[PDB]
Amino acid sequence: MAEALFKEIDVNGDGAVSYEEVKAFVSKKRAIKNEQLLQLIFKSIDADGNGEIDQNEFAKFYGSIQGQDLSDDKIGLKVLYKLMDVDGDGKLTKEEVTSFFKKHGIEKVAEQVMKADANGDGYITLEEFLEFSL
Numbered sequence: 001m002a003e004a005l006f007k008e009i010d011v012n013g014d015g016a017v018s019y020e021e022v023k024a025f026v027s028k029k030r031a032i033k034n035e036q037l038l039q040l041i042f043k044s045i046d047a048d049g050n051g052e053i054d055q056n057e058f059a060k061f062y063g064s065i066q067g068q069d070l071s072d073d074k075i076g077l078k079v080l081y082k083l084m085d086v087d088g089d090g091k092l093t094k095e096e097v098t099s100f101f102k103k104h105g106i107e108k109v110a111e112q113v114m115k116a117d118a119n120g121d122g123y124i125t126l127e128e129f130l131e132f133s134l
């Protein structure tokens with residue numbers, strides 16, 4: 001119900017979203033400076049700059065720009081990781097990620113995780129983990 005959401009939020013029921021409407025939409029999720037973050041995204045998708053977008057721009061906006069595999073997998077990834085992490089660190093490492101994932105048997109995750117982290121530090125955070133997908 002992606003669209004149903006876009007139209008839903010649009011109490012007006014016209015078939016278009018705005019900066020405030022979208023702000024509220026995402027806001028419904030969290031409040032990690034969605035105002036600014038969004039402002040950036042919006043302006044990104046918004047080529048003209050009417051300050052308002054439509055279901056189309058909204059759909060493309062939901063992802064990022066021009067590329068989306070499975071956002072649900074992303075939100076679900078953070079959700080899970082958030083569920084597991086009961087220590088309350090907010091951050092994770094390649095050893096911890098591989099340690100937990102290893103349970104599954106997919107070590108490749110360590111390879112993709114190691115390649116993803118082209119820093120050499122050997123650690124990552126939730127913010128970096130999310131933005132990493134973006």
Ligand SMILES: [Ca+2]
Pocket residue numbers: 009010011012013014015016017018021
């Ligand atoms: Ca509207």
Ligand SMILES: [Ca+2]
Pocket residue numbers: 045046047048049050051052053054057
């Ligand atoms: Ca627009």
Ligand SMILES: [Ca+2]
Pocket residue numbers: 085087089090091092093096
């Ligand atoms: Ca942790």
Ligand SMILES: [Ca+2]
Pocket residue numbers: 117119121122123124125128
């Ligand atoms: Ca890192």
